[PDB]
Design a protein around this nucleic acid. Sequence first.
RNA 1: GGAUACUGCGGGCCUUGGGACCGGGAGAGGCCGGGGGUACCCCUGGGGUAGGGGUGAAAUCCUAUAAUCCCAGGGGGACCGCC
Length: 127
Amino acid sequence: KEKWGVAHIYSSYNNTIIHITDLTGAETISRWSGGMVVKADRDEPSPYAAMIAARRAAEEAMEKGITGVHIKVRAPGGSKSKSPGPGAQAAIRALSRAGLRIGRVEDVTPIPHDGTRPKGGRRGRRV
RNA sequence: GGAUACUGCGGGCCUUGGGACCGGGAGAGGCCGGGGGUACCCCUGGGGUAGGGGUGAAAUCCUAUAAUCCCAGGGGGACCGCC
């Protein structure tokens, strides 16, 4: 019988996290990061590491009995950036290739209607 | 001693400058009260297991007393996106 889950994709400028849950999101099936498939800090946000982590999570989910996946993609947001990193699309392509069927795609980045003051000071970063 | 155009002084008149009033409308003008909206931080439970964060590259830092992540709830302070 068809079994559906959700895939949360947290993508920042420094790392990517692919986390598969049931539909309620209350039960975890497979959670992989880009800091487990490489060992150099400067390559965790790589679309390659994203592809790899997504492939492994999809393998485990399939073995556990999950055939379909809805997607929820997420930049950090809030007072931080609202644009996702370069790993989300690669992760989605990897999820599709691994054999999982894909359903609805949605963006669930949090946006303030208005928000706590952001960290850089009045001037911002200068280097 | 003479004159009366201009200024001044005294008395009347006028409505153009200014003030008052009526009407239907515009506006993030100000004060008071009431009701909310997301997002952020902490606490309490359920899941899951080894990294998370950060940089030009790193390290201090957090994390097996179970972090990052997802779910259900409770509390708090500031501000009010797009249009």
